[PDB]
Design a protein around this ligand. Structure first.
Ligand SMILES: C[C@@H]1C/C=C/C=C/C=C/C=C/[C@H](O[C@@H]2O[C@H](C)[C@@H](O)[C@H](N)[C@@H]2O)C[C@@H]2O[C@](O)(C[C@@H](O)C/C=C/C=C/C(=O)O1)C[C@H](O)[C@H]2C(=O)O
Ligand code: HEM
Length: 391
């Protein structure tokens, strides 16, 4: 009898009864996943943060095609190899050395004008169209994609076509459709990488080509970035709009002052999804005794960021949306060597759009009561199916 996890959408600002019960009853539990496999679930902020620094947990497994999974995704399968634990950790460290400088404070400051231009253009169009409008499909997804394309070096005309492909690679209910979407996207990206070698621009693909990587790895890094920076930004943005609409005093504080806005963006990150934010699978590379249990070599270890983010051991009043919360040690961008390398751009995108959205549309709010918002099914990182708003 292992507790069995599900894919039900979370409620606003509150862990589900199963997740609250597991967090109350200890820091780590053997569970069953939506795919039907067994896993460890870590439920508290201190212990999760401690596993994020434990080099026994990583993206290697002796036998990747029989490894326990949370959901079945040919995209996530690309992440796991049968390299030994040291060689995997080496691969990963090299990856971080190359991606980390692409988002330096200087480079992020240089990105700002185009992030702000893109938000203006899209918000003009959204507003021209008049209420009600699908915030998700017509604003947050296209803004995150536009920004990402500009930074990575994908031409803007490709935006409609990537929206389709990046949805395709994330299908959970259609293995062949997902493999095919992956082949097509990769074929496009690999063509783009080759173009850029002949004609470099101030963009990530060129910066990665200026180094010692194979064509193949440059393409894989670019494709991973395109998937990592799209629906994540949209999810945090969609939920921040819901939360900020629902908390008028908090919103007013945020818009009144750019330092409350910077704090408010961290509180949106902490509270956007109260559960269900389960990261790509990681595995123990050897047995380890942790949190009163013995994790075995090969066991799946799951990180659901809602759990630590709502842990009352780490946060005073974790169910309260406090736009001024400081400090705010949320784990929404991960930590340690599993830490978001795009976080500086994501934060810029969030401050930029929250500010413009609520400045221009002070009364912006979802049309439906929150409990009637519908989540996309059968899609990795799927977020809302639509987010109709009025103003
Ligand atoms: C080069 C590689 C390639 C990319 C792999 C991407 C994995 C994405 C996982 C998203 C998972 C999750 O998606 C979920 O999938 C379930 C099936 C659904 O039933 C849920 N409805 C939800 O859509 C968690 C999401 O996470 C977020 O979006 C953050 C999420 O990027 C963090 C993952 C970073 C991965 C980096 C990485 O390896 O770089 C916020 C989002 O707020 C969070 C969330 O939605 O709760
Ligand atoms: C607010 C939106 C975002 C959120 C919530 C988020 C969150 C995360 C998290 C939790 C991780 C750790 C994943 C893991 O350990 O499995 C991660 C890693 C990563 N993120 Fe983000 N991210 C966001 C936006 C972005 C953007 C805009 C980019 C790129 C332009 C990006 C690029 C990456 C990459 C390349 C990694 C893997 C880094 C590594 O291999 O260690 N992310 N992100």
């Amino acid at each position: 009898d292992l507790p069995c996890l599900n894919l039900e959408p979370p409620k606003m600002l509150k862990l589900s009864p199963l997740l609250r019960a597991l967090q109350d009853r200890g820091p780590i539990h053997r569970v069953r996943t939506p795919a039907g496999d067994e896993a460890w679930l870590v439920t508290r902020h201190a212990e999760l943060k401690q596993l994020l620094h434990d080099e026994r947990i990583g993206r290697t497994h002796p036998d990747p095609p029989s490894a326990a999974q949370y959901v079945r995704s040919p995209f996530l399968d690309l992440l796991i190899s049968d390299a030994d634990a040291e060689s995997g950790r080496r691969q990963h460290a090299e990856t971080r050395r190359l991606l980390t400088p692409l988002f330096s404070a200087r480079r992020v400051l240089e990105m700002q004008p185009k992030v702000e231009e893109a938000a203006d253009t899209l918000l003009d169009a959204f507003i021209a169209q008049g209420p009600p409008g699908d915030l998700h499909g017509e604003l947050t997804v296209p803004f995150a994609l536009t920004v990402l394309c500009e930074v990575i070096g994908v031409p803007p005309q490709r935006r409609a076509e990537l929206t389709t492909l990046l949805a395709g690679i994330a299908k959970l209910d259609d293995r062949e459709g997902a493999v095919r979407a992956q082949d097509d996207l990769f074929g496009y990206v690999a063509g783009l990488v080759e173009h850029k070698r002949a004609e470099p621009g101030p963009d990530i693909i060129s910066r990665l080509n200026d180094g010692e990587l194979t064509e193949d790895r440059v393409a894989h890094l670019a494709m991973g970035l395109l998937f990592a920076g799209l629906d994540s930004v949209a999810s945090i943005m969609d939920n921040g709009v819901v939360l900020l609409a629902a908390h008028p005093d908090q919103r007013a504080a945020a818009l009144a002052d750019p330092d409350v806005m910077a704090r408010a963006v961290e509180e949106v990150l902490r509270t956007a999804r109260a559960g269900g934010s389960v990261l790509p699978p990681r595995y123990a590379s050897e047995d380890m005794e942790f949190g009163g249990v013995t994790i075995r070599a090969g066991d799946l270890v799951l990180f659901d960021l809602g759990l630590p983010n709502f842990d009352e051991r780490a946060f005073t009043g974790p169910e309260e949306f406090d736009a001024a919360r400081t400090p705010n040690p949320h784990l929404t961008f991960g930590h340690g060597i599993w830490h978001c390398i795009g976080a500086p751009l994501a934060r810029l995108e969030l401050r930029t759009m929250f500010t413009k959205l609520f400045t221009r549309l002070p009364e912006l709010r979802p049309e439906l009561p929150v409990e009637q918002l519908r989540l996309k099914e059968g899609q990795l990182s799927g977020g809302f199916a639509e987010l109709r708003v009025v103003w």
